[PDB]
Amino acid sequence: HHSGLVKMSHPSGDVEACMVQVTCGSMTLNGLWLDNTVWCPRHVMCPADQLSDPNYDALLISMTNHSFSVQKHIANLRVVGHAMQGTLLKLTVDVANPSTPAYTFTTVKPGAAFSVLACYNGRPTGTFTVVMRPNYTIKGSFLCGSCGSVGYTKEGSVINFCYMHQMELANGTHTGSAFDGTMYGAFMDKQVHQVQLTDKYCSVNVVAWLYAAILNGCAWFVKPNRTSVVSFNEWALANQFTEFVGTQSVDMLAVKTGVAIEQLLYAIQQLYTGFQGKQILGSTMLEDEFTPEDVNMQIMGV
Amino acid sequence: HHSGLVKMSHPSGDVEACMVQVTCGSMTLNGLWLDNTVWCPRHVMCPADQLSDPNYDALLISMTNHSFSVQKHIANLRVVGHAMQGTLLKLTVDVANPSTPAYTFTTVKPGAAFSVLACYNGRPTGTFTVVMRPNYTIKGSFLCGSCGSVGYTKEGSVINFCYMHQMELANGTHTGSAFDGTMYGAFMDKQVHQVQLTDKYCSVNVVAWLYAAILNGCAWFVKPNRTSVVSFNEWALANQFTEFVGTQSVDMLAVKTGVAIEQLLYAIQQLYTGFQGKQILGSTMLEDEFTPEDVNMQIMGV
């Protein structure tokens, strides 16, 4: 009856120990302290009268190490170097974080889930998980002062940082930077109207959810009928779905349930025209916020 | 468009530092290490051949301090005392947890939200948030080995522990103990069929969600019509809703939006008969998994 699915985040302690406050004049936000480096959004440099068209190159040149104040309240970290990488600053500090976890930097892909640690004034305040939408936004929960909050995944003990928060778009969704300094999607870290690409249903995550339903004894939508991946993907382009790309994680769900991917691609095509008053796992609309990995881990223990 | 609402958990670091593994013979699960005490479910004492009708008094008497092995892997903690409090063991250990947070023990009430740290073999693996249902279950995500995982709320820096995981009921929901040793509801920590009370919509949380909708510019369901609290509560008893009890947190939402509680109680009565193909915050059914506090904090910054 209950699916056994929740929105599951990584434990956040490893990352909490890396959060600091960064102040530059009238601007304050959060940074990430790893080894002798503090990462933060570059718009910490920007006076509010200039957030709509900052000249970041000129702002950077105008700064000295004194221009940045970094504090940990969970130490004052003296800045001894400063540099800009895309939309992020790299501040060099005189003390290496003694609690630096094993970490990498990676870019997250549409449909994939990651954990966010929402922070204000360098203080962690909550944690949640989101999927990167096909239009490179996330449906998060961020208020003024939240920039520099980070998103990450975890492989073993290694934290893979993938997101640093920057902006809330007009429709209430959120976007930010990867740690290579790029913004996700076509977004810019300028406080002006920006075009939003269309969101889409993440087909591989809808497939995962339908498997979750079968793993819970809910399979009324499973029929012998099948749609091929190539045929579904042509259909997807006309109906606001991502093209489906199967993975080993989806294959494990097909094996466990004995229901083939192509059967669920046909189910999705029919469900999209309407559930006809039936429910799947308590919903009367397709759910794409759980991944194949979520289902394998939370339900099957993998 | 996006509500700005997510399922938000507390940062989990403070609690991660308190989790240990407890082993008693063939049974292993998680414990909570605070000061010189380790709390864990008492069914760690129970051989698997006896989980359906354990004699816990006899099991306790049969134990010595050697009968419990406690490890931290995030130390071996030597047990120097053991006692039973309701459905929990209180193990006394020779070393006080140097990372004991400020804490209290409290009982959580139906409709209220708390954060859970899911742990296996004493290792934290994920965090999520749930509301205590009116039938004293939670819709969680727990597998074999998860018992002893804890739920908590946070007031300031003080962690209020309210839940220690025990059981998965036939319908996939979960229940456990408070730290006074009671099980929530009428449940017993015995592996046998147990009656489940009916779940209900948490009216105060539906009211909160409708305010969240108004705070997002979505107010098509607001009319001048009103239903009194007394009249709604009579109706609720016939329709599987909790009786509504207003709070200061709900009042702040009424003030901010200028929409009175009684207007939303009337809205709920009508929405319950059908949304007539309209959506509220992306849903075509009433949502009761967000609290008034969630809405005040996540949307209004309170």
Swiss-Prot record, chains A, B:
It comes from Middle East respiratory syndrome-related coronavirus (isolate United Kingdom/H123990006/2012). Residues 3-302 form the Peptidase C30 domain. It catalyses: TSAVLQ-|-SGFRK-NH2 and SGVTFQ-|-GKFKK the two peptides corresponding to the two self-cleavage sites of the SARS 3C-like proteinase are the two most reactive peptide substrates. The enzyme exhibits a strong preference for substrates containing Gln at P1 position and Leu at P2 position. The active site is at H43 (for 3cl-pro activity), C147 (for 3cl-pro activity). Coiled coil: none annotated. This is 3C-like proteinase nsp5. It comes from the Viruses. Cleaves the C-terminus of replicase polyprotein at 11 sites. Recognizes substrates containing the core sequence [ILMVF]-Q-|-[SGACN]. Also able to bind an ADP-ribose-1''-phosphate (ADRP).
